């Protein structure tokens, strides 16, 4: 909605837009370069701190030898290490409750961590993208579909309330003799 658009760094919608989790670091020689996982708005200003919701972490893209742990004859442990600090309470808050967006590189990271499934942009160019036809899918679905109530209860436990009360803690929480 700017009369003469700022041409180089366009976005979608008005700024500040919905918060997006980005990786960003000042540019330098490749030997020292680190990145910041940051929840911030869609439209950045000159200094990235002006719109910054939260600071999620440091990520160093240099494979490192592990000198912190003792040298271990185990094969896998002596592959190089890649270090990252995730703040996952803030991540689950922002992503889950506040409904963030995600750039692709942080997505790859958080996929490695086990917080998210691997991204849309991670492609083994070995396999193609799948085909689809509705009648075959339908045969498979009629073949396997679970009961309605089972499914409803699964959606209940995953989305709505998890912690529930067994009859036991009811019986243990209900008042005894003098006020019963």
């Amino acid at each position: 909605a700017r009369a003469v658009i700022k041409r180089r760094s366009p976005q979608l919608w008005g700024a500040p837009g919905a918060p997006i989790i980005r990786m960003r670091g000042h540019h330098v020689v490749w030997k020292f370069q680190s990145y910041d996982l940051v929840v911030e708005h869609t439209h950045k200003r000159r200094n990235s701190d002006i719109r910054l919701l939260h600071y999620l972490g440091k990520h160093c893209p240099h494979p490192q030898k592990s000198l912190w742990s003792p040298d271990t004859p185990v094969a896998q442990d002596r592959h190089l290490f890649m270090l990252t600090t995730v703040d996952i309470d803030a991540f689950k808050y922002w992503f889950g409750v506040k409904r963030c967006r995600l750039s692709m590189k942080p997505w790859a990271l958080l996929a490695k961590a086990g917080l998210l499934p691997p991204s849309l942009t991670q492609n083994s160019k070995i396999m193609p993208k799948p085909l689809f036809d509705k009648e075959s899918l339908m045969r498979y679905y009629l073949a396997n579909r679970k009961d309605e109530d089972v499914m409803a209860r699964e959606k209940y436990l995953n989305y709505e309330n998890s912690m529930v009360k067994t009859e036991e803690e009811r019986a243990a929480e209900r008042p005894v003799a003098p006020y019963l």
């Binding site: 330098v28 020689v29 020292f32 680190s34």
Partner: protein, 190 residues
């Protein structure tokens, strides 16, 4: 790394372990004053600027900083600083408007001591109770006119002498004998 010597430096891009990442601003610049005016003619009536002027506020030596702790915060729990003030009513020439002189506090950390400054406010008294020389409680509120954000919350001490003085048709307080100072000599005789 600010703790490393001039010669000890290797990389300027990162902190190896921890600590504070510090930009050196160059404090000693030998900054100077340019003299653009004759000592005779300086283009200001009240003050003259002949040297480098110290700048900033709170960056100003010796530092004078806001002191939350004084009488006013001692008595009140304020939702916002300056939401309550105790003062004296000085003058009512304006309808439904009481001017109030109030004290607040400044701290000099260099000398470790406090000073009281003073400031005037316009307060809104509907119904016109306040007589000059009342001790009043005053609160922050809705914007009322250009300069009135404060209203008279309670009269702590009314002026009984002043009220009885008014009832007799006389002014609340005698008008001050001399006004503001002047740089002239007024010769006015008889």
């Amino acid at each position: 790394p600010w703790w490393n010597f001039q010669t000890e430096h290797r990389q300027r891009c990162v902190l190896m372990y921890g600590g504070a990442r510090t930009k050196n601003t160059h404090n000693a610049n030998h900054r100077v004053f340019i003299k653009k005016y004759k000592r005779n003619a300086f283009p200001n009536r009240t003050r003259h600027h002949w040297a480098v002027s110290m700048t900033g506020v709170l960056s100003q030596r010796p530092r004078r900083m806001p002191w939350p702790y004084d009488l006013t915060s001692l008595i009140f729990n304020q939702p916002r600083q300056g939401s309550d003030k105790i003062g004296y009513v000085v003058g009512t020439s304006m309808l439904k408007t009481a001017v109030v002189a109030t004290n607040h506090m400044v701290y000099y950390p260099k000398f470790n001591q406090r000073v009281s400054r003073t400031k005037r406010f316009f307060a809104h008294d509907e119904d016109l109770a306040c007589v000059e020389g009342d001790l009043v409680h005053i609160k922050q509120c809705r914007k009322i006119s250009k300069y009135k954000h404060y209203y008279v919350f309670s009269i702590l001490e009314p002026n009984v002498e002043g009220r009885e003085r008014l009832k007799l048709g006389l002014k609340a307080v005698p008008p001050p004998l001399f006004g503001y100072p002047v740089s002239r000599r007024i010769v006015k005789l008889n």
